[PDB]
Design a protein around this ligand. Structure first.
Ligand SMILES: CCCCCCCC/C=C/CCCCCCCC(=O)O
Ligand SMILES: CCCCCCCC/C=C/CCCCCCCC(=O)O
Ligand SMILES: CCCCCCCC/C=C/CCCCCCCC(=O)O
Ligand SMILES: CCCCCCCC/C=C\CCCCCCCC(=O)O
Ligand SMILES: CCCCCCCC/C=C\CCCCCCCC(=O)O
Ligand SMILES: CCCCCCCC/C=C\CCCCCCCC(=O)O
Ligand SMILES: CCCCCCCC/C=C\CCCCCCCC(=O)O
Ligand SMILES: CCCCCCCC/C=C\CCCCCCCC(=O)O
Ligand SMILES: CCCCCCCC/C=C\CCCCCCCC(=O)O
Ligand SMILES: CCCCCCCC/C=C\CCCCCCCC(=O)O
Ligand SMILES: CCCCCCCC/C=C\CCCCCCCC(=O)O
Ligand SMILES: CCCCCCCC/C=C\CCCCCCCC(=O)O
Ligand SMILES: CCCCCCCC/C=C\CCCCCCCC(=O)O
Ligand SMILES: CCCCCCCCCCCCCCCCCCCC
Ligand SMILES: CCCCCCCCCCCCCCCCCCCC
Ligand SMILES: CCCCCCCCCCCCCCCCCCCC
Ligand SMILES: CCCCCCCCCCCCCCCCCCCC
Ligand SMILES: CCCCCCCCCCCCCCCCCCCC
Ligand SMILES: CCCCCCCCCCCCCCCCCCCC
Ligand SMILES: CCCCCCCCCCCCCCCCCCCC
Ligand SMILES: CCCCCCCCCCCCCCCCCCCC
Ligand SMILES: CCCCCCCCCCCCCCCCCCCC
Ligand SMILES: CCCCCCCCCCCCCCCCCCCC
Ligand SMILES: CCCCCCCCCCCCCCCCCCCC
Ligand SMILES: CCCCCCCCCCCCCCCCCCCC
Ligand SMILES: CCCCCCCCCCCCCCCCCCCC
Ligand SMILES: CCCCCCCCCCCCCCCCCCCC
Lengths: 221, 223, 223
């Protein structure tokens, strides 16, 4: 079941990438860079999850799905870039604020991988550093980045706020599931955690980019 | 023999880098970035192949030898080669960084699929191999499609030089997956020693040769 | 003692990052990018050294201890330090990103050669070590040659500050390969505990100290 679910994930990621490619042919005032980012995220995630389907992306008395971290270390910074470029749509880019989010995010993902390889108290030291990183990313998202979106007009700011809430809501689920599942307290079963880390990324990657790009295309008229 | 051939490779790469450094002192209207890229490619490749000569850049997986240092080489050197090609098409005009980074993304994936294919057994090997080939096909479509159209927009002389260098690179690049498949990593029709000679001779033309043809053409547009 | 010293290091790095964050709120004409670089360096180094304190960032290779977390630290922190230096020379003038990326390329290679040297036995160790030293020499040539000439082109006050920071960095940086060679990784004339103290004290001056001297100088060109 685990293998079949991961094949199904990869196929949906492929269809997502094709959809974003088609949209890019009629860009409706959205820069090509934003279409490219929306295509890379699902293609990279699909390839990583494919490695799990074929039984290569994990190792073993607990099973670590390391391919998830290889996915997230590329896909999550690109998602924060898409969010930041949304706030900055039609105005000056602030690359310092963008790269601050990339730096925080990559650290967050590495702390999670190390936490998964750790035993005892040490696991929860690393986990905690990752959570603090996520908190600061959320403060930036709803503080200075939202202020940039407001400075680009009410229509843009409204779309930014919607996409920020969408992403923020899905992102807090990852560390929660991690903690309740085998990697943490083990209150939830392996099969449960797998279903969560199949369904969340579908909404997190393909869903987010549909909502994000349609909103920006609608500002062309 | 295998060790000595890799020492010889590294020494030729060093001489290549020194030659490009000298050329950079009299740049003849070619930006410094293009000289830097031409120097990094052979220096990085030389260091990787040196690790093979010293017997560090390989290990034994079941009954086969994996030359993993090749992948450490190619993951840096091949994206820089596609950048040099893209900057050639864009010479005297606006840079399109989105198209450049699309080629880098495709290329890095292509090289990773090859490394994983080399570590795989049975059908799984050929799934990864196949994904890498599709990546290479899309790179070739970009090279002869949108990137060639950018070269045309920068004038007849430049477009002619671009087309020559693109064919040169395209011809050498299709040899890598072919050799991979016929050698030990694939069907095993060719011996280890054969594959080694191929992955010594091809990179010399692919790295140092390509950059000589590429840079001399661009320097000739100054006069 | 080794574990306690690494906790103390991480805590000092945290306080360094906080100080640079406060300074960034009243930037005094220094771009936000230079404050961000000064914050990333100590935070990344602190996290790496924390992994040593918890006993995860090292392993036993043959009969010696490799502190591999140091290399994970330096491969991110040292290129960012050379970037801060380069941006100091270029303060109030055109950025030369080709010269900046040349320093990053040299530096990353230098750090990788060190990691491979630490994993090597016999002559091979000293081949890799030597390639890293040559990289450091070329970085020093750039620092006191073309990069210092850019600083002079941005005026006497800036050039004076650049020269001070360049000497400060150059002085600390030559200590790393010296200590490496005298300690367990090399000839073994110095004890593990000695080497540890050196690779706790030097980075404090190398990271937090350098950025204090660097940023205060640039802020003073505003007053
Ligand atoms: C923690 C893991 C590694 C993270 C490294 C990320 C690098 C951080 C530094 C980036 C510099 C940002 C450059 C921005 C330039 C434009 C400045 C602006 O106009 O805002
Ligand atoms: C498989 C791993 C891939 C990692 C690299 C992914 C890169 C994606 C990001 C693209 C950045 C595009 C730069 C945009 C610059 C706009 C100006 C222009 O295009 O001329
Ligand atoms: C050993 C690993 C090497 C990885 C780093 C690769 C460095 C090569 C890239 C060069 C980019 C050049 C910078 C762009 C030039 C902009 C114009 C300018 O200001 O000079
Ligand atoms: C491309 C996306 C990244 C995929 C990487 C993970 C898989 C690589 C590991 C291959 C090992 C196969 C042998 C085995 O573990 O049984
Ligand atoms: C749990 C979620 C925690 C963080 C929520 C966001 C924090 C408040 C937004 C930033 C305020 C501001 O700087 O304007
Ligand atoms: C929506 C919330 C999902 C709740 C699922 C809990 C059951 C999983 C388990 O404990 O194995
Ligand atoms: C810079 C060059 C990059 C390539 C280097 C790879 C070498 C890796 C070294 C691994 C240790 C080998 C162990 C041994 O000597 O038996
Ligand atoms: C793995 C990374 C793969 C992604 C590359 C996608 C290729 C897209 C080509 C079109 C580029 C463009 O938007 O102009
Ligand atoms: C699309 C292009 C794909 C090209 C790939 C071809 C390799 C197919 C597999 C080769 C036969 C395997 C036989 C065997 O394992 O014995
Ligand atoms: C910056 C943060 C990264 C620091 C890197 C350290 C890697 C730690 C991995 C150790 C795994 C556990 C080893 C063990 O318990 O024996
Ligand atoms: C392998 C690890 C590589 C890590 C490299 C870290 C990134 C290096 C340098 C980026 C800094 C560039 C700063 C440009 C700022 C431009 C400006 O402010 O004018
Ligand atoms: C240490 C050596 C520094 C030598 C400085 C050379 C300056 C002249 C130059 O080559 O540009
Ligand atoms: C100042 C010089 C510090 C170095 C002298 C102490 C060496 C101790 C040792 O070799 O164990
Ligand atoms: C049903 C399996 C589909 C495989 C598609 C290819 C993998 C995703 C993109 C990489
Ligand atoms: C252990 C083999 C893993 C190979 C894939 C490497 C991808 C790393 C990207 C960061
Ligand atoms: C392992 C680290 C990989 C990080 C991925 C790179 C993300 C950078 C994307 C930034 C795009 C900026 C677009 C400017 C217009
Ligand atoms: C043994 C259980 C330990 C639980 C650790 C939870 C850490 C939460 C971190 C919150 C930081 C604010
Ligand atoms: C991986 C090795 C990288 C080589 C970089 C070479 C740097 C030389 C720069 C020349 C100086 C330009 C002025
Ligand atoms: C994970 C490994 C990633 C390797 C990436 C190598 C870097 C290739 C991109 C550099 C080329 C950019 C040149 C821009 C020219 C602008 C003038
Ligand atoms: C696996 C990597 C390849 C997946 C490609 C997805 C579909 C995109 C087609 C792009 C064609 C570009 C031509 C200009
Ligand atoms: C056995 C290995 C096969 C590798 C073959 C690589 C592809 C060969 C070239 C075919 C694609 C050409 C694309 C040109 C498009 C023009 C627009
Ligand atoms: C022994 C057989 C050696 C085959 C060498 C093929 C290399 C092709 C290079 C073309 C330039
Ligand atoms: C570590 C230093 C703390 C950084 C917190 C930044 C939060 C952003 C503030 C915006 C008002
Ligand atoms: C891994 C290290 C990452 C550190 C990033 C620190 C973030 C600083 C906050 C950004 C500036 C906010 C401006 C208001
Ligand atoms: C036996 C140990 C010998 C040490 C060799 C170190 C040489 C110094 C670095 C190379 C400099 C090249 C000029
Ligand atoms: C005026 C030309 C530059 C002279 C450089 C002097 C050498 C500096 C070495 C410092 C290392 C300690
Ligand atoms: C057999 C003794 C080897 C001689 C060692 C020479 C002295 C130390 C060389 C390394 C110093 C690094 C700084 C170079 C600049």
């Amino acid at each position: 079941m685990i293998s079949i679910l991961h094949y199904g994930y990869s196929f949906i990621m492929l269809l997502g990438a094709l959809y974003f490619y088609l949209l890019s042919k009629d860009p409706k005032g959205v820069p090509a860079s934003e279409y490219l980012i929306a295509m890379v995220i699902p293609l990279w995630s699909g390839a990583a999850y494919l490695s799990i389907a074929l039984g290569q992306g994990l190792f073993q008395d607990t099973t670590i799905y390391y391919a998830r971290y290889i996915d997230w270390v590329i896909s999550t910074p690109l998602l924060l870039a898409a969010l930041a470029l949304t706030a900055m749509f039609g105005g000056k880019k602030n690359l310092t604020l963008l790269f601050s989010l990339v730096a925080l995010d990559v650290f967050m993902i590495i702390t999670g991988f190390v936490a998964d390889l750790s035993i005892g108290t040490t696991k929860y030291i690393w986990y905690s550093l990752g959570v603090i990183a996520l908190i600061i990313i959320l403060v930036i998202t709803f503080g200075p980045l939202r202020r940039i979106a407001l400075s680009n007009g009410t229509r843009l700011a409204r779309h930014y706020t919607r996409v920020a809430i969408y992403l923020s809501a899905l992102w807090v689920c990852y560390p929660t599931a991690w903690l309740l599942g085998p990697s943490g307290l083990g209150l939830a079963q392996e099969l449960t955690e797998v279903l969560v880390f199949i369904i969340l990324p579908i909404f997190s990657k393909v869903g987010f980019s549909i909502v994000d790009l349609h909103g920006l295309r609608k500002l062309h008229q």
